Amino acid sequence: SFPKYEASRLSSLPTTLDPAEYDISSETRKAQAERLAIRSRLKREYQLQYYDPSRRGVIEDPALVRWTYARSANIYPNFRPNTKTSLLGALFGIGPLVFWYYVFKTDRDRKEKLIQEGKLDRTFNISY
Amino acid sequence: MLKYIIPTIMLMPLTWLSKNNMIWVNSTAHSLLISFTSLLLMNQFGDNSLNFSLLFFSDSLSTPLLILTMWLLPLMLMASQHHLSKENLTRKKLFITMLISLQLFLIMTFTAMELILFYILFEATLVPTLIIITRWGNQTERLNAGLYFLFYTLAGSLPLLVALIYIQNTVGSLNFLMLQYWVQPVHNSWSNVFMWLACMMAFMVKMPLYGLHLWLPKAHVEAPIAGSMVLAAVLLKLGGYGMLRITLILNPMTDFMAYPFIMLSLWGMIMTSSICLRQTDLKSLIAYSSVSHMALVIVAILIQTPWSYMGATALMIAHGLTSSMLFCLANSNYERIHSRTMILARGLQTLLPLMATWWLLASLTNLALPPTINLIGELFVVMSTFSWSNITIILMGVNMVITALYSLYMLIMTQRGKYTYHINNISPSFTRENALMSLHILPLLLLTLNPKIILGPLY
Amino acid sequence: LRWQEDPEPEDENLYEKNPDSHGYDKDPAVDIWNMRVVFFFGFSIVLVLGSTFVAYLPDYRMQEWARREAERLVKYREAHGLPIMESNCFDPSKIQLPE
Amino acid sequence: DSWDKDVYPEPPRRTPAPSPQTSLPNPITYLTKAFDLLVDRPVTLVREFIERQHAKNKYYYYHREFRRVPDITECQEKDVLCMFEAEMQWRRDYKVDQEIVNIIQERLKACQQREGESHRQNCAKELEQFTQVVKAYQDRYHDLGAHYSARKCLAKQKQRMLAERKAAKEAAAA
Amino acid sequence: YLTHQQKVLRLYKRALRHLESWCIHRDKYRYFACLLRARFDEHKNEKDMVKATQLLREAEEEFWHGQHPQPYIFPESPGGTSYERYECYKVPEWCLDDWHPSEKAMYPDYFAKREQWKKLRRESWEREVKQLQEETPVGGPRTEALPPARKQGDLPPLWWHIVTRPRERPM
Amino acid sequence: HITKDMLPGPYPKTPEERAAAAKKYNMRVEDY
Amino acid sequence: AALQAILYNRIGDIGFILAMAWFLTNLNTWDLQQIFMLNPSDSNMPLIGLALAAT
Amino acid sequence: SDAPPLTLEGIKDRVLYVLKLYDKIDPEKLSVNSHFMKDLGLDSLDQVEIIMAMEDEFGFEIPDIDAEKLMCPQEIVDYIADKKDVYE
Amino acid sequence: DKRFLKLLRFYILLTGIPVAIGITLINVFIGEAELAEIPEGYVPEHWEYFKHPISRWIARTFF
Amino acid sequence: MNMFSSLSLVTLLLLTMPIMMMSFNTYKPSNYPLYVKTAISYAFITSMIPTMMFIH
Amino acid sequence: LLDLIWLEAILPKTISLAQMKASTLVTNQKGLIKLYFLSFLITILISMILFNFHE
Ligand SMILES: C[C@H](CCC(=O)O)[C@H]1CC[C@H]2[C@@H]3[C@H](O)C[C@@H]4C[C@H](O)CC[C@]4(C)[C@H]3C[C@H](O)[C@]12C
């Protein structure tokens, strides 16, 4: 009796239970060899100028430039006003504003009427 | 007000006629003397403002802003000494000339008694501001930032010019002393709904208001050190200051025309504050923080109550001495590693022990830690808005929680943690950098002893 | 190449040529004096004398005067058995209401 | 010599006499003597030295008194030289009336502490005065907004008077 | 990757530490320590790929269902209480170039020998660069392992950041 | 120094663009 | 852990700001001496604010 | 931290001590360069338990990637000396 | 970092000590003023409505 | 009351003395831990006199 | 979405885009004397007929 472990985006599937990690062929093994190839090709480019004694500065990291350039300055050029963007924009953008306008219009109007009729307790309210 | 205009002009003859290795020493010395003499404007009385002549007056709203404006010119000269070391002598002189011109227009903007003179000088602080950003920036995006900055302001200022001229013809004058005793209620009609927007829109783009705020993340990020400090300390308060004066001739229509603007600001705080948590650029994070704090200022002015106007002044002065410090602290890192990304240079509390203390004080003030003047300003606004509507506590409270997350998060990411291994040029902090932060934080804490001098005219 | 452009100049560490540098200028004679004016006028003249000047300002916005004034009125008001504070700011004998 | 006793009332003191009933010593009595000898006595000597210095050079600061002037109700419309006189005076009354309320709030707050657990009953006189001056203040200096002016205050009074004199007709004409 | 031979060993070591948590006591723990070892010996000799993998794959399912929710973690291991407790004192060695002469004259011997190490590093650099170029394949390194020095007068390539690392207890 | 070609950009459509992008980000055409 | 404590304390401080606002508006004071003397009868809101802060 | 400083001599004595108490290794034919596979006849499972015994002796884990690569008491002594920074 | 603090302390106290010394001497030997009723037919100068000697100096010399 | 007031305030100020001395560098290093501990002790005794006057 | 896309989409980007399009229509002329003067005729006929500028 070993109930299945059901994962989610907040509970990753353990590497020791993933089926793909127990069925291994030559073609699958080849990929791991080349993933480690790039993983080792970049290491030396870093370690050739990391260990240099005639260096006083920062090591430019293109992997970081691409990450931050994509996060800020490459969103609009890749935006199509489709239906997903349109509906979400209206719901997220203008949706909250409409909600709060009527929540405060109703309250103030209700609070206005009570003071008009003089049935609101304001005995000691002299700071506003 | 001629005792502060002529000396500020005389800096330019001093700057150009000085020796070639004393332009920074002379300019910094006599700017501080002008700042020292600025204290004479605290002669305010409880009933009548101080009226020097037909052109200039200084009540309690402008005295805190004049002193802050004149106290930054000495600091912006210190901050610019480094990245202008490898610069031609003549261009360095022109750079100082632009800074002195900006101070001259600002000291006159906050003192002008006529609203037309206010508009001319309120608009004249765009030429020197635009030239500093575009000429002496660093990124290619600086040119596109100057365009957004110029046209956002002018797209709203031109309608204002048509309202002030109209008001003079239909009232008789724009002198602010007269308008107190000659103002008449604004009848509710479609014609006046557009007079109201004309008078207010020109000042809600410089605050800035949420929605009309895309020029701030570009101007305050691509601008040099001197431009950013003045931009987020002295040029955002022009809109807030202008509204405090222009809403004198907009009652009772201000009661029902402020709903679309309060809601934008109340929900603009949460939105912009949330955007801080997920920023990769350290300068940008400090740029969005300004929008969040100024949204309290806009709501404070609209609700038109004594407790909002008092806190509104405090939030403007306190924010100026906090944002300016944060930019200077963020720039100290940028003058060593040469990359604005926040996650690149981590663990700096093990290499720069004293500089990790200024971050803390600046960060502590940003999150409104009592009893600093940031808290007094924010507390008062949170009291006035509660009377306006009880439910406002839900929105105002959420901002305080989020504001603590991104202020301390910035502290943790850059300072705490494990230092970067391949960053091997983190030189010890200079005296110049340390003196720059001290002049930001020491004034910001002494005011807590005597806060009455930053609470505006209602006090 | 696409043009004859100078190579990016390496950063200069100001602590090398002048280990006692204050960070202001590359000329040791200039650097010391720049620090002195920043420290002297900035701190001694503005943040010490300035703090004293603000502390000892004459009564600011006559806040104190209103205190003595009120004490006089409260004494007078209670001595003669009048209300401490009226509910009308302007005497309702100089007002002519509509109709 | 000190603050006027009429503005800030203080009930008469009632100090119980000591009633020891044990042979053990009283640490408070001894510590009081030590305090009066190693602390209180030196302080008095220095103050008397400082007090005598002020006697050599004595001078006065006077209380500013404002001659009263016509109020806004006596000012023609758009006559700034008269509205200015009436508005500035009205403001000095706004500042003073605030202090009048503050002095009452000290009295109320003082009584509660002095009365200890019996504050509900023995401070009713102070509380009643507070409920009055607050009502008066709220009538003449409330809901005027941030741009308060004599004109708006007069408008509020002329509005309340209309309701007061209007509502009376229906009630009084029974 | 992890060969099937390596997987069991990791599953054995990790199956003992967790089993140690439940038992706590030495007497009880040793009793079931032997029993666990037997279950690995009763099938170790089999050399069938399908049967071998299935048992290992099936054993992990049992392991997951029985893992202690709060396994013992060493004080300075990943996730432990003292992990990284002393990262705030490991100052990089290059910080000593920025010292003032006043605070270098207090340690004349250490800064005299440091020059010896500094002089050595400059002399041994060009040799290390050359050594890697020839032995590096045409494409590039295909594994993460440096070659040792291959003659007198040389130091192993890329040695400065493995030799001069901060001590585990700087202060 | 980062050149234009070594930055993110528009969504690829053709397999050569996918293969070219996988080299830009230092990955493999099978994982990118 | 350090940031977590700030986050939870700040959430509670919403109740603390709520109570100050209510006392100032409905009693015109922050001192405890005056709050006790005026002894509000409708006090579900200010006291729930303190209860939130206490949590 | 107010604890005795490990020494190259001290570590070597304790590595051999644990092995000499293991009831699968003849004490007399155990030396400082005794391979556990050939020179002593122990499979890979036994080497896993030997590592666990050593770390319990010193109270600091050795990773799996490195643990399998130690098959000699000298290697154990050197590895511990490298983690604790022993130079004498 | 230490050198910066020494300069800040030195200059804060460069004028701090005389100001602390000067303020004390004024209070001990010149003291405050006393409140008096305005004599009949007398118009006090505008710097004769404040208490502290230092404040009356600001009123007379600057404001 | 004369003594009750003075001894209640001196408890608070005494605790701020170590901070003030350390700020302007008016202390001796290597002894601060024993300095701050001693200040608490004398602050504990000074707090008792107000307490005893309350009990009585 | 609400800061880098839509608030950019509505006011700044679309207003600028319209100006670029209009500038093309006004400046995409062919430099013909024949085509310019033929338009002057249309303006006068429009003025006299549609708007009555002749009166
Ligand atoms: C009294 C206390 C411990 C005495 C003891 O346990 O033997 C000692 C330890 C270090 C001392 C302090 C340091 O010597 C630094 C200061 C030097 C002077 O004694 C004045 C106070 C001063 C701050 C001292 C007060 C006190 O005497 C201290 C605090």
Ligand SMILES: [Zn+2]
């Ligand atoms: Zn640099």
